Design a protein around this ligand. Sequence first.
Ligand SMILES: *[C@@H]1O[C@H](CO)[C@@H](O[C@@H]2O[C@H](CO)[C@@H](O)[C@H](O)[C@H]2NC(C)=O)[C@H](O)[C@H]1NC(C)=O
Ligand SMILES: *[C@@H]1O[C@H](CO)[C@@H](O[C@@H]2O[C@H](CO)[C@@H](O)[C@H](O)[C@H]2NC(C)=O)[C@H](O)[C@H]1NC(C)=O
Ligand SMILES: c1ccc(CNc2ncnc3[nH]cnc23)cc1
Ligand SMILES: c1ccc(CNc2ncnc3[nH]cnc23)cc1
Lengths: 540, 540
Amino acid sequence: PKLLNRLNTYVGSSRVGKRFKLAERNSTFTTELRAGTATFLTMAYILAVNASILSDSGGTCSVSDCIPLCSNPAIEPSQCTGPGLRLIQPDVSCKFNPVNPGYAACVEEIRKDLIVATVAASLIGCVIMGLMANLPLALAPGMGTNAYFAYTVVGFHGSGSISYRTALAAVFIEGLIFLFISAIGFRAKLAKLVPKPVRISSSAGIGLFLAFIGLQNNQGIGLVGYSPSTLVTLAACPASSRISLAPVITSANGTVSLLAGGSVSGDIMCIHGRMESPTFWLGIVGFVIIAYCLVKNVKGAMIYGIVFVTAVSWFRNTEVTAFPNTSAGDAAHDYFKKIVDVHVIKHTAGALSFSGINKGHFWEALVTFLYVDILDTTGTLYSMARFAGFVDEKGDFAGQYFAFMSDASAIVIGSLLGTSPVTVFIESSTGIREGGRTGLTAITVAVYFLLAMFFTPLLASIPAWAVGPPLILVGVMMMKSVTEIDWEDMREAIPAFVTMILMPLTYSVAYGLIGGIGSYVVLHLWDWGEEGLVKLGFLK
Amino acid sequence: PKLLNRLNTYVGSSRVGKRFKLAERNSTFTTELRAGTATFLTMAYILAVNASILSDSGGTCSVSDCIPLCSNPAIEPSQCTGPGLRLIQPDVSCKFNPVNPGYAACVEEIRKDLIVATVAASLIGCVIMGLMANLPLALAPGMGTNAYFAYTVVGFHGSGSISYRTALAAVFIEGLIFLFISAIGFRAKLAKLVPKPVRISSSAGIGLFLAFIGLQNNQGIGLVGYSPSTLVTLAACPASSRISLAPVITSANGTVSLLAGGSVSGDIMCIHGRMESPTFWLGIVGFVIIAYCLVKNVKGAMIYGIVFVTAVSWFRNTEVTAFPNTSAGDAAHDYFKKIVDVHVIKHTAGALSFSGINKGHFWEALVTFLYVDILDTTGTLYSMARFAGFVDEKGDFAGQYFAFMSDASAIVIGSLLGTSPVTVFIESSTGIREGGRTGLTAITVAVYFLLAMFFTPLLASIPAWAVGPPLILVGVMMMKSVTEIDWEDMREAIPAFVTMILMPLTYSVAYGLIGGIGSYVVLHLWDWGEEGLVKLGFLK
Ligand SMILES: *[C@@H]1O[C@H](CO)[C@@H](O[C@@H]2O[C@H](CO)[C@@H](O)[C@H](O)[C@H]2NC(C)=O)[C@H](O)[C@H]1NC(C)=O
Ligand SMILES: *[C@@H]1O[C@H](CO)[C@@H](O[C@@H]2O[C@H](CO)[C@@H](O)[C@H](O)[C@H]2NC(C)=O)[C@H](O)[C@H]1NC(C)=O
Ligand SMILES: c1ccc(CNc2ncnc3[nH]cnc23)cc1
Ligand SMILES: c1ccc(CNc2ncnc3[nH]cnc23)cc1
């Protein structure tokens, strides 16, 4: 008849085929492979974006890896011996602009480690879900939680209140708690605990947060910069026309002087040449490519746009080059020259630290991770169940228990590997839309992720303006939940608006959730008191 | 019969009552007075908010009103004569932190002028609408266009690309163009010119812009400040723990030095004491009051909240005082002591300047004003027509022609008086919901606005944390239009998301509109080309 049909029949009637319930679900082997391929194409952008975002966190190292610098840049430290010439001992400021070369070497090694960790965590989560849960779902580091972990919990180059190791410990304990509450069937009560407008608008707030990240400089395509009067205006001037800032002391005449120890910022203030950055326009071209691919229902839109922008930036002597003519750029290019490489995690693997448990910021981050994972994973898993036709009248889809246990275990494993919480991706719908019904789709995505390794050099050379439009369009996709908010009801609109707007402005998911929940509670205090009095009988 | 019934019958059967079509519309005199009172209570927040926002623009004066300052602050300029002691000639930096006392005196006088101008423009617009158009609509300076005029077209303290006089000329010409296109009936075609997603999402973008303004320091309650790494984090530390930023030059070793001529910012960076500013918490209390009042359908929610916050801030020796122990604070308190005052516009009246007509920024601001006014006024006027039951099968409500002419004339008059474009308020619905059907409602609102004069001292002493929650909640109400966007369609979602997110981030309504329209045009180039080829017959 046909070799493909022969393979399908052979696998469907084999022990593995019965194990995966191929016949019972009306798809045998090639449908599962095609669904896995479609899901991997849809979610391949994570391989670049997660690594970039988590590398921006600074990794595991501290000032300890900052090298001493000579008094004048013209003399290398080894030659820094002469009259009036001394080595400068690195301090905390070594981590920020101007970034110490040793800390840049950190960030590059940690980016390689985080690429490998992303791939390994996605592979392990996909395998666990495919085997123990037997569902066509793909697991990978959470896009939404990625930025919260990197820029809020830890902060850029470890400028947050919680260290990277302590944040990994927080993710580990959050995964353990999620596993426990899923096991005891106590997860739905917490899901119900959050107010409706807050849970509905948290996704839109996170989408705005990601889009704002994609419009920054060290994070995306630019187009948003610093303004002395408004704090944000139109960026996307060339990097040669961007300048940094330092705190100063004003007075009653006009004198202003530097503040010793001030935390200088990156090159965020445009002095001229607005809307002239070639990198911004390359990112805009990538944005247009991804937007057309999404509109045309082309699988792999984001990966195609990222690939185009990165390929354009791989040329060595252009204004959009990913390998500038510097020592760091030379090292990056040398690493990129080897197309394939088997990189071994040496820093982020098993880098947990339980020193910050007593700190309140640790618990804030832990609770934010836990509730984001609860709400997101519950919604996504049940949506996938509905899409695949596994939901029955009672609302359960058989493997839900093991599905949530697989998600929690994947979170724990990713935390051990050194990455933000790993969740089930909505992109799995593509595979489900392609006919994937068993766990073989997850195994196929895991095999594709395994192939994603051996390409760390290519994945480690992706610039910010390539991450860029992927972030902006992920925010666009996240925004679709706003339609479920009754904006005519202030008791629901005000908390929802606060949740949406505080995440990008305060720039923290936890602060947005706290503000939304607090506004909801405050606005419903009157109603709750009235209802309590009525129950007591004081009022009719 | 009740005296009210005699008055109603007498007025309804009189020449004025027949002129206003009282009997034909089933409301005679007391319904119109009640509707006007309700509309004025709903829209009274403008009297404070518009004046504050337009005063933040810096007004009409330049460095010419900055007084020379002595070398040391301990010596007043009149005593600035001695060895090594000299007077500093004011420059552009005199307008910004530290603000020159002369420019502060400007801003205060201009705030009084702009309070009077707001009241006069609202009164004139309401009278014109009530007489010429005979509709129960209230006209007042546009809340949405207020912030765009102050912080984007002109900029804080005249830091924008267009001067205040040139911006007034832009508003004047925009009003003239709006009047012309309304008269020749081409307004509908221009309204149809804008893409649907951009048109729908512009209101939400402006709402986010207003909320962001309300979450700033010199504009609202704080809670959003500067961050070296993220550009925005959690503010609301006490003013004593806020410091300014100045541009610096980095190097390859770590040296950083001030940049001569750098535009120093306000006290936006919190060094410690986050979430501890008493002014932020007073603004939060005002927000809570306005939020319950909106939830409880209490008319005048915003004015009640503003009044509470201002009354708390009117005490002289507190940390939330609107009159700090300074020369400027002493002058503000002295002015506030006289409860009533007949202030005469002396700076902003007739301050038009047509010098910047050749500049492209002038035309950008003009087009943004024109299209915001077109879309907003059309939508609001037609919504009010549907609500009042003046709409026929064809969609015309009789006085629409003169309604739009009245709106354009009010815009022109407000520009002459020195205020941003004046539009018909959605708060007029309250008056329509109360039974107002004729122009007597507009005349009643105009009389209330006239009474609003003689209270400039009370209205000029309203702090930023009082403006604050009004801005945030206006943004909340503006957000309700997002539900009309089909977020499942990327070809429609992406332009809408860009429009929503660019207005607060780039901090400009014009930039948001430009980005949204450009994304819409780019994403439809393929479809438009395909349709053109099909029409030509190349494709089936
Ligand atoms: C880092 O190198 C710079 C050279 O650009 C040093 O700059 C000194 O300080 C200012 C800025 O150039 C000048 O007034 C001095 O003349 C510079 N010195 C020299 C020798 O050029 C800067 O001092 C160096 N860092 C430190 C900590 O000394
Ligand atoms: C402005 O006033 C200050 C008073 O605080 C003057 O004092 C200067 O203060 C800075 C640091 O705050 C020192 O570095 C300067 O050496 C001080 N100057 C003197 C003369 O003592 C300051 O000089 C004044 N500036 C001007 C331009 O008049
Ligand atoms: C709210 C919504 C989404 C998230 C991030 N997780 C997530 N969930 C589902 N699908 C994804 N693809 C990429 N990331 C995700 C967090 C909070
Ligand atoms: C979009 C939406 C609204 C506006 C601002 N005008 C406006 N229109 C209607 N009602 C109001 N009350 C206060 N301002 C307004 C501009 C653009």
